[PDB]
Amino acid sequence: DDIYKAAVEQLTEEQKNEFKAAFDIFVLGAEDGCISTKELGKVMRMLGQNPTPEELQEMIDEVDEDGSGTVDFDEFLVMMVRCMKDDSKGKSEEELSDLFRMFDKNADGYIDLEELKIMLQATGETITEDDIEELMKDGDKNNDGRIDYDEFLEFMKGVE
Amino acid sequence: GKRQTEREKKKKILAERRKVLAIDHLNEDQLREKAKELWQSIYNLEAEKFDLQEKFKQQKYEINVLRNRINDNQ
Amino acid sequence: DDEETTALVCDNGSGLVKAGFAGDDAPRAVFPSIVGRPRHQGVMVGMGQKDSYVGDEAQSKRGILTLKYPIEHGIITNWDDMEKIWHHTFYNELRVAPEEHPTLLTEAPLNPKANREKMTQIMFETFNVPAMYVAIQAVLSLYASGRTTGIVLDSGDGVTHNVPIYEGYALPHAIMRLDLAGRDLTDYLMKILTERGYSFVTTAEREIVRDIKEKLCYVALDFENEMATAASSSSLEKSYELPDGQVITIGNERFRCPETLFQPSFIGMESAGIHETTYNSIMKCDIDIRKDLYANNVLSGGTTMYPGIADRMQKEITALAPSTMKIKIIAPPERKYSVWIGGSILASLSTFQQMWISKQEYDEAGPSIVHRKCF
Amino acid sequence: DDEETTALVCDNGSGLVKAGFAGDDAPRAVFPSIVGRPRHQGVMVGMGQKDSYVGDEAQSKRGILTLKYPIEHGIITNWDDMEKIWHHTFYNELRVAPEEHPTLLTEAPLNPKANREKMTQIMFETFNVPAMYVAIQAVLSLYASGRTTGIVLDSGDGVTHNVPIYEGYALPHAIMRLDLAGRDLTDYLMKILTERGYSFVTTAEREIVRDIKEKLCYVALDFENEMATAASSSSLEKSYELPDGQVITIGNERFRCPETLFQPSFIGMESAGIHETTYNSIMKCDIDIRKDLYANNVLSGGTTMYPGIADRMQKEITALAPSTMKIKIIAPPERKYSVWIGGSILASLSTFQQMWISKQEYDEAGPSIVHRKCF
Amino acid sequence: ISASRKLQLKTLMLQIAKQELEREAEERRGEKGRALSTRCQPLELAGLSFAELQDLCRQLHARVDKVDEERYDVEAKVTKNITEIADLNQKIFDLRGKFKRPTLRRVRISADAMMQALLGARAKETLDLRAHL
Amino acid sequence: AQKDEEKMEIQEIQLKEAKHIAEDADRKYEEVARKLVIIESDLERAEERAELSEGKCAELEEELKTVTNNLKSLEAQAEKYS
Amino acid sequence: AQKDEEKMEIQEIQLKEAKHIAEDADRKYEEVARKLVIIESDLERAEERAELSEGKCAELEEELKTVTNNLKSLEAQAEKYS
Ligand SMILES: Nc1ncnc2c1ncn2[C@@H]1O[C@H](COP(=O)(O)OP(=O)(O)O)[C@@H](O)[C@H]1O
Ligand SMILES: Nc1ncnc2c1ncn2[C@@H]1O[C@H](COP(=O)(O)OP(=O)(O)O)[C@@H](O)[C@H]1O
Ligand SMILES: [Mg+2]
Ligand SMILES: [Mg+2]
């Protein structure tokens, strides 16, 4: 998403200090200023921060849609500073309970691919082939066709 | 048990809520306002009862979901 | 389903509680009726340990519990535990509040009055049902067979009773109730297993002996010949794996455990076997309905599921009865749930819909209403 | 951190004192529990020579000290030295005054009462803690594995004990405590090293033999084959450099030292090895929880860190146990600190927060409060 | 699978779901008002007299009794459901604890930070002790 | 003293190399631990599902045996009544 | 010169510790390699055998259905015979 400007303005010193240290480690001369994300990940690994890196490497293999491979500040800088948990409040548990109860038109304790497709047609998103399998992963942790409310809670918890 | 305490509490609530029974001793407007206010009160009580019924059905469904959870734990 | 109101056909039994809504083929939830408090100390904190596991939950944690049945011989000896069992049955195995459903309990013949009165008082005060009715466990088993005559031998797990019925008119002077049943067979099997070295003592291991009895024991067609054969060959020795290994081999204990039914002198009981109390129950009937009772002998109850009992009993009765009468033994494959199927059929009838003990009637006459016209 | 109050999870042990604040992954300070007075005369004046070096300081000046452990076999034999060790642990290794922190000591099973009562009396009178609680060293090791059942063999350095637990209900009649542990293995290794010419006698050189045992010894998968192989080839002889040179070569002493665990007849003990006391501890349990205990055998304690023990023990138990059961041995890589990790987890629980022995309770009932409900 | 597209789709779906829930709550409120107007028909007192007032008083007392009994039964049901909610909440708490309490811990609050001070402290202590002269 | 300074700097660069090797080994260790945890969890699930299948097979086999024997007996009786 | 020598001794001990780290890392890594391979092989075999049992169980289901139908037939014949 486009949180890039608010993020470059919003970071507080607890992570800004390490950002500056990583900047010093990164840029020592004869650099274009784009800050290559390949060296950035190694530098942050050297810093001792403990987020998840494999998603970042895959993203760089995909994200920055033009396929430049040298991410400018926004996206790879976010992936770097993603050590800190600036989440979307996790929403509210009661809100999601009310939503899931609303979605349970079957009134059988769970919502399956038919109801998900019904809601998607109600909103009108681009049809994805990752469907079915996404429900199997998130909601079907028991391989039984049953999905409780915590599965939907952790499906999009703190999503921006 | 679970048959007499409910009855006594209900009778006590009836006594405290059903006020003094006296109408024809006063003017038409005072009785008209009293009847209108009591009718609006019973309308509020009925609306609250139906809302609590819908909430009870929702919480019965939630209890069923939590039952399915405790069944999934075994 | 939808509008309308369905009846709850509960069936307390003694050993397995069978329940379900009226109008189906099989009970919805069948689970042992045992309530077991934990007996050790418990050191893990916050494990969420309850104070009493009832029903089928206590058949999985039975390693650290002391299971105790709340129903000894038909009668109920521990009312708090029975109330707990009923509460579990209504709320967790069926998930239907009892405030909106009639109930149809079942009771053995010739039981103490106080048991029945306390049962109805509980159902009306604690669970607060709209209306409940108590029925004799043998008439239902006769319903399920689709007959209208016949003498039914309902050998449950608590008590074996033998109610003869003709043309719908029960004969109250010919009911022969005998207190030998599946539980005594379990105890006798547990007692004769000690002759090979296997000692089961704990109340939890009684369940293991019960499983052995269910899976291995069978009723011999002729007792002496089987005793002679098992003492020479070894074609009978069937092995069984305990819940931890160490397989055991049951020899002539296989057909000696259920033989107690036909010779109650094995466990020291004086009375005659189930093969002779049926003939005595018939002979007390009038001289003109004995042929029909001979031809329509019905078996029911769990304990009559032993492989080979419908032939041994027929042979015995044919030996006792006059040579001209035809002896036929009805043994439906759905024997175990026969009483509950009959209960469902009875609760589904329109003619029966006005026999329930309505709550206002109980409020006017007290718990002693059950002995009155609403039987 | 900040406001609030954290608990001190101390763990006396016997050989290594492990301590740290509740809620972390590893103990903050781990140091040997030895107190050694100097033994020579001392001629330099003003050198600042103390009268007793405790903890890790006496493992560096051990050349002129006489180290003596204050805990022999679980029990504490020298209370003044133990008090000194505790004082050091609180003030110099953690630097937190005990007046503002609850403590959670640990104690082996089946220990003398007087030891536990004196421990609580010291903690409440001398150090003046707010509240302390004593826990059995095996339940914690079961906490750390994240299980709730299983039989845990906690072979420490003082005493090896084997506590079976099911569903959170400990079985007090099946605890098998054996007094063979790491210290006896050190003494036996020091005794068999003399067969090559190396003589270690001083109490300081016991530490060198302990280091040899830690770095070189391993448990053989099959004892006779290893004894035959080491007597023909020379592929086993591993060398080791003493604290002054003169390297030594250990031959078949490598797997003979830790073999004493499975054959306690080597050091003259009568009892059976740790491979057979676990099976005996299982067989004392009820017949229905033996499968779960077989499948969840847990190892803990320092001495179970020998390379190749989790396979030898599994082979032995599989030989003893019935062929159908599956034998699985849980050997987490963080074995040494398993008890302390479990202690941290237990102290961090909210449900446990009201089980501490509050000081006012001790003032009302005396030190004998520990045996009471607050266990 | 993408990263940005899934994020945006999930956010839009959550917002649309919240809007749908709010409009469904509003529709249910409208239907509840309609059912209020049915079960409790509004009374227009235009051109009214004493007799209709007294009839309203009697019918109102009878309906108050009936609805009070109905609401008492409903409230007893509500109390039972709340107790069941508490019991199920306690059970779910216990189960989530037996799941994730070992996983819920402070991993090396300061042990990770304290890495190299001990070695330097030992060496500098030896040197400072030697530094008497 | 000059020779000693030379040896000091050489050991210094060696020590830095040592620290880096240590960190690399540490990362490898964390990685392999993760992998082992995952595979063992899969082992648990595989064994349990195997057991379920085996038990169900046993039960169905027994029921087949019983019903088959009853059918055979009743067939013999059908011939008898013929 | 003496200060430099002290520095050298410190570097020596640190190098020793580093090599010690290397050895222990290698040993543990080889151990986990062994466990990984054994776990993987056993997982494969267990999945295979469980699927085999599942297939046999389905076959048993079909057999049981056949037997049930035939028993229904024989029962009807016997009752008509009666
Ligand atoms: N397949 C079987 N073979 C032999 N005995 C059985 C079998 N099933 C149940 N039983 C015996 O019957 C008892 C169950 O009888 P049941 O009819 O449930 O009693 P109740 O009349 O109380 O319901 C069990 O205790 C068991 O001993
Ligand atoms: N890596 C190792 N290999 C073999 N033995 C060890 C190892 N680490 C410790 N030990 C033995 O274990 C003992 C430490 O055990 P520990 O668990 O600290 O005892 P306690 O239960 O008193 O804390 C040491 O005396 C040592 O003999
Ligand atoms: Mg019965
Ligand atoms: Mg220990």
Short mmCIF file of N, CA and C in Angstrom, two decimals, chain D residues 256-351:
data_model
loop_
_atom_site.label_atom_id
_atom_site.label_comp_id
_atom_site.label_asym_id
_atom_site.label_seq_id
_atom_site.Cartn_x
_atom_site.Cartn_y
_atom_site.Cartn_z
N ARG D 256 33.00 -46.90 29.18
CA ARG D 256 32.85 -47.66 30.42
C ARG D 256 32.43 -46.78 31.58
N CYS D 257 32.82 -45.52 31.59
CA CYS D 257 32.36 -44.61 32.64
C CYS D 257 30.85 -44.40 32.63
N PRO D 258 30.21 -44.03 31.51
CA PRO D 258 28.77 -43.81 31.56
C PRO D 258 27.95 -45.07 31.45
N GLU D 259 28.58 -46.21 31.18
CA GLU D 259 27.87 -47.47 31.22
C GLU D 259 27.38 -47.81 32.61
N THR D 260 27.98 -47.21 33.64
CA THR D 260 27.54 -47.47 35.00
C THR D 260 26.07 -47.14 35.19
N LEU D 261 25.54 -46.22 34.39
CA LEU D 261 24.13 -45.88 34.50
C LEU D 261 23.25 -47.08 34.24
N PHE D 262 23.58 -47.90 33.24
CA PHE D 262 22.76 -49.04 32.90
C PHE D 262 23.15 -50.32 33.62
N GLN D 263 24.29 -50.34 34.30
CA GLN D 263 24.71 -51.47 35.12
C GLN D 263 25.30 -50.95 36.42
N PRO D 264 24.46 -50.56 37.38
CA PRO D 264 24.99 -50.01 38.62
C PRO D 264 25.77 -51.02 39.45
N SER D 265 25.95 -52.24 38.96
CA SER D 265 26.82 -53.17 39.67
C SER D 265 28.28 -52.80 39.53
N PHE D 266 28.63 -51.91 38.61
CA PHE D 266 30.03 -51.53 38.44
C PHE D 266 30.56 -50.82 39.67
N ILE D 267 29.77 -49.93 40.26
CA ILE D 267 30.22 -49.21 41.44
C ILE D 267 29.65 -49.87 42.68
N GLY D 268 29.26 -51.14 42.55
CA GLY D 268 28.82 -51.91 43.68
C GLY D 268 27.38 -51.70 44.11
N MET D 269 26.65 -50.81 43.45
CA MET D 269 25.25 -50.62 43.77
C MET D 269 24.45 -51.83 43.33
N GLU D 270 23.44 -52.19 44.12
CA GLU D 270 22.65 -53.37 43.82
C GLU D 270 21.63 -53.10 42.72
N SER D 271 21.03 -51.92 42.72
CA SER D 271 19.81 -51.67 41.97
C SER D 271 20.03 -51.82 40.47
N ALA D 272 18.93 -51.78 39.73
CA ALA D 272 18.97 -51.91 38.29
C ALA D 272 19.20 -50.56 37.62
N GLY D 273 19.61 -50.61 36.37
CA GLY D 273 20.02 -49.41 35.68
C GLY D 273 18.86 -48.48 35.40
N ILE D 274 19.18 -47.35 34.78
CA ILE D 274 18.16 -46.36 34.48
C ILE D 274 17.29 -46.85 33.34
N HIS D 275 17.71 -47.91 32.67
CA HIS D 275 16.90 -48.50 31.62
C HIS D 275 15.81 -49.41 32.15
N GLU D 276 15.96 -49.90 33.38
CA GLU D 276 15.00 -50.83 33.96
C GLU D 276 14.20 -50.23 35.09
N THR D 277 14.70 -49.17 35.73
CA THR D 277 13.87 -48.51 36.72
C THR D 277 12.78 -47.68 36.07
N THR D 278 12.97 -47.25 34.82
CA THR D 278 11.88 -46.59 34.10
C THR D 278 10.78 -47.58 33.77
N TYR D 279 11.15 -48.76 33.29
CA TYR D 279 10.13 -49.77 33.00
C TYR D 279 9.41 -50.20 34.27
N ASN D 280 10.13 -50.36 35.38
CA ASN D 280 9.45 -50.68 36.63
C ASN D 280 8.54 -49.56 37.08
N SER D 281 8.97 -48.31 36.90
CA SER D 281 8.11 -47.20 37.28
C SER D 281 6.85 -47.16 36.44
N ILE D 282 6.96 -47.54 35.16
CA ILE D 282 5.77 -47.60 34.31
C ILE D 282 4.86 -48.72 34.77
N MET D 283 5.41 -49.91 35.02
CA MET D 283 4.57 -51.06 35.35
C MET D 283 3.83 -50.88 36.67
N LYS D 284 4.29 -49.99 37.55
CA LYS D 284 3.52 -49.73 38.77
C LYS D 284 2.29 -48.89 38.49
N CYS D 285 2.25 -48.20 37.35
CA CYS D 285 1.10 -47.38 37.01
C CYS D 285 -0.07 -48.27 36.60
N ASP D 286 -1.23 -47.64 36.41
CA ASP D 286 -2.43 -48.37 36.05
C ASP D 286 -2.30 -48.91 34.63
N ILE D 287 -3.14 -49.90 34.32
CA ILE D 287 -3.00 -50.63 33.05
C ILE D 287 -3.44 -49.81 31.85
N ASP D 288 -4.16 -48.71 32.06
CA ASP D 288 -4.73 -47.97 30.94
C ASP D 288 -3.94 -46.74 30.54
N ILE D 289 -2.91 -46.36 31.30
CA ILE D 289 -2.13 -45.19 30.95
C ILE D 289 -0.71 -45.60 30.61
N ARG D 290 -0.47 -46.90 30.44
CA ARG D 290 0.88 -47.34 30.12
C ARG D 290 1.27 -47.01 28.69
N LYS D 291 0.32 -47.01 27.75
CA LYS D 291 0.66 -46.67 26.38
C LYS D 291 1.13 -45.22 26.27
N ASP D 292 0.42 -44.31 26.93
CA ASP D 292 0.80 -42.90 26.87
C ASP D 292 2.16 -42.67 27.51
N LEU D 293 2.43 -43.32 28.64
CA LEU D 293 3.73 -43.17 29.26
C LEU D 293 4.83 -43.77 28.38
N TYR D 294 4.54 -44.89 27.71
CA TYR D 294 5.51 -45.46 26.79
C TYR D 294 5.83 -44.48 25.67
N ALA D 295 4.82 -43.79 25.16
CA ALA D 295 5.04 -42.93 24.00
C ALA D 295 5.64 -41.58 24.35
N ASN D 296 5.60 -41.17 25.61
CA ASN D 296 6.03 -39.83 26.00
C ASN D 296 7.12 -39.87 27.06
N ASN D 297 8.08 -40.77 26.92
CA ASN D 297 9.18 -40.83 27.87
C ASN D 297 10.07 -39.61 27.67
N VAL D 298 10.31 -38.85 28.74
CA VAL D 298 11.03 -37.59 28.67
C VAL D 298 12.36 -37.75 29.39
N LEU D 299 13.43 -37.21 28.80
CA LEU D 299 14.73 -37.14 29.43
C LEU D 299 15.01 -35.70 29.83
N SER D 300 15.72 -35.53 30.94
CA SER D 300 16.09 -34.20 31.40
C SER D 300 17.41 -34.30 32.15
N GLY D 301 17.77 -33.24 32.85
CA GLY D 301 18.94 -33.24 33.69
C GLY D 301 20.23 -33.28 32.90
N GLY D 302 21.31 -32.88 33.57
CA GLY D 302 22.59 -32.77 32.89
C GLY D 302 23.12 -34.10 32.41
N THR D 303 23.09 -35.12 33.28
CA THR D 303 23.79 -36.36 32.97
C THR D 303 23.21 -37.09 31.78
N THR D 304 22.03 -36.71 31.32
CA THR D 304 21.46 -37.33 30.14
C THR D 304 21.91 -36.67 28.86
N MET D 305 23.05 -35.99 28.89
CA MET D 305 23.61 -35.33 27.72
C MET D 305 24.69 -36.14 27.04
N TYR D 306 24.91 -37.37 27.47
CA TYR D 306 25.95 -38.18 26.85
C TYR D 306 25.58 -38.46 25.40
N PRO D 307 26.52 -38.35 24.49
CA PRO D 307 26.21 -38.62 23.08
C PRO D 307 25.86 -40.08 22.84
N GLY D 308 24.62 -40.35 22.46
CA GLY D 308 24.20 -41.69 22.17
C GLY D 308 23.39 -42.36 23.25
N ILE D 309 22.83 -41.61 24.19
CA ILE D 309 22.05 -42.23 25.26
C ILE D 309 20.60 -42.38 24.85
N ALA D 310 20.07 -41.45 24.06
CA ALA D 310 18.68 -41.52 23.64
C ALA D 310 18.42 -42.70 22.72
N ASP D 311 19.46 -43.34 22.20
CA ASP D 311 19.26 -44.54 21.40
C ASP D 311 19.44 -45.80 22.23
N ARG D 312 20.44 -45.81 23.12
CA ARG D 312 20.62 -46.96 23.99
C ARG D 312 19.42 -47.17 24.88
N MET D 313 18.89 -46.09 25.46
CA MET D 313 17.74 -46.23 26.34
C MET D 313 16.53 -46.73 25.58
N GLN D 314 16.31 -46.22 24.37
CA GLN D 314 15.17 -46.68 23.58
C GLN D 314 15.32 -48.14 23.21
N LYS D 315 16.52 -48.57 22.84
CA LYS D 315 16.73 -49.98 22.53
C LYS D 315 16.45 -50.85 23.74
N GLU D 316 16.92 -50.44 24.92
CA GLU D 316 16.70 -51.24 26.11
C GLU D 316 15.22 -51.34 26.46
N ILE D 317 14.52 -50.21 26.45
CA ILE D 317 13.11 -50.25 26.81
C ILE D 317 12.32 -51.04 25.77
N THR D 318 12.65 -50.90 24.49
CA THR D 318 11.98 -51.69 23.47
C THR D 318 12.21 -53.18 23.69
N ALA D 319 13.41 -53.54 24.16
CA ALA D 319 13.62 -54.93 24.52
C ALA D 319 12.72 -55.36 25.67
N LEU D 320 12.57 -54.50 26.69
CA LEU D 320 11.77 -54.89 27.85
C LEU D 320 10.27 -54.83 27.55
N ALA D 321 9.81 -53.79 26.87
CA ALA D 321 8.39 -53.53 26.74
C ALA D 321 7.73 -54.51 25.78
N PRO D 322 6.40 -54.62 25.83
CA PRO D 322 5.70 -55.43 24.83
C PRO D 322 5.94 -54.92 23.43
N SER D 323 5.93 -55.85 22.46
CA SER D 323 6.33 -55.53 21.10
C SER D 323 5.38 -54.59 20.39
N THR D 324 4.14 -54.47 20.84
CA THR D 324 3.18 -53.66 20.11
C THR D 324 3.31 -52.17 20.42
N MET D 325 3.59 -51.82 21.67
CA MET D 325 3.65 -50.42 22.06
C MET D 325 4.77 -49.70 21.33
N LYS D 326 4.55 -48.43 21.04
CA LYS D 326 5.60 -47.61 20.46
C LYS D 326 6.37 -46.89 21.55
N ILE D 327 7.69 -47.00 21.51
CA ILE D 327 8.56 -46.39 22.51
C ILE D 327 9.21 -45.18 21.87
N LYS D 328 9.00 -44.02 22.46
CA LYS D 328 9.56 -42.77 21.97
C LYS D 328 10.22 -42.04 23.13
N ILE D 329 11.41 -41.51 22.90
CA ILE D 329 12.19 -40.87 23.94
C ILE D 329 12.41 -39.42 23.55
N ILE D 330 11.82 -38.50 24.31
CA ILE D 330 11.92 -37.08 24.03
C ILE D 330 13.23 -36.59 24.63
N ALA D 331 14.13 -36.09 23.80
CA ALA D 331 15.43 -35.59 24.24
C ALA D 331 15.66 -34.22 23.62
N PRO D 332 15.09 -33.17 24.21
CA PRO D 332 15.25 -31.83 23.66
C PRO D 332 16.70 -31.40 23.73
N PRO D 333 17.17 -30.59 22.79
CA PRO D 333 18.55 -30.09 22.86
C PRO D 333 18.84 -29.25 24.08
N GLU D 334 17.85 -28.57 24.64
CA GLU D 334 18.06 -27.78 25.86
C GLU D 334 17.80 -28.62 27.10
N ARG D 335 18.45 -29.78 27.18
CA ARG D 335 18.20 -30.69 28.28
C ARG D 335 18.69 -30.13 29.60
N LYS D 336 19.89 -29.54 29.61
CA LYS D 336 20.51 -29.17 30.88
C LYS D 336 19.65 -28.18 31.65
N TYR D 337 19.12 -27.18 30.97
CA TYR D 337 18.33 -26.15 31.62
C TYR D 337 16.84 -26.42 31.55
N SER D 338 16.44 -27.66 31.27
CA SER D 338 15.02 -27.95 31.12
C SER D 338 14.26 -27.65 32.40
N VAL D 339 14.82 -28.04 33.54
CA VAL D 339 14.14 -27.79 34.81
C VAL D 339 13.98 -26.30 35.03
N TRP D 340 15.01 -25.52 34.74
CA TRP D 340 14.87 -24.09 34.98
C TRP D 340 13.92 -23.43 34.00
N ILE D 341 13.91 -23.84 32.74
CA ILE D 341 12.94 -23.28 31.80
C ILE D 341 11.53 -23.58 32.27
N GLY D 342 11.29 -24.82 32.70
CA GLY D 342 9.98 -25.14 33.25
C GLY D 342 9.66 -24.31 34.48
N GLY D 343 10.65 -24.05 35.32
CA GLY D 343 10.41 -23.22 36.48
C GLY D 343 10.01 -21.81 36.09
N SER D 344 10.66 -21.26 35.07
CA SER D 344 10.29 -19.93 34.59
C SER D 344 8.87 -19.92 34.07
N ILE D 345 8.50 -20.94 33.29
CA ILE D 345 7.14 -21.01 32.76
C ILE D 345 6.13 -21.08 33.89
N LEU D 346 6.39 -21.92 34.89
CA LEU D 346 5.46 -22.05 36.00
C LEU D 346 5.34 -20.76 36.79
N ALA D 347 6.46 -20.07 37.02
CA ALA D 347 6.39 -18.82 37.76
C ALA D 347 5.71 -17.72 36.96
N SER D 348 5.70 -17.82 35.64
CA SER D 348 5.07 -16.80 34.82
C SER D 348 3.57 -16.98 34.66
N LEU D 349 2.99 -18.05 35.20
CA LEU D 349 1.57 -18.31 35.02
C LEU D 349 0.73 -17.44 35.94
N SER D 350 -0.43 -17.03 35.44
CA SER D 350 -1.37 -16.27 36.25
C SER D 350 -2.12 -17.15 37.23
N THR D 351 -2.45 -18.38 36.84
CA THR D 351 -3.18 -19.28 37.73
C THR D 351 -2.37 -19.64 38.95
#
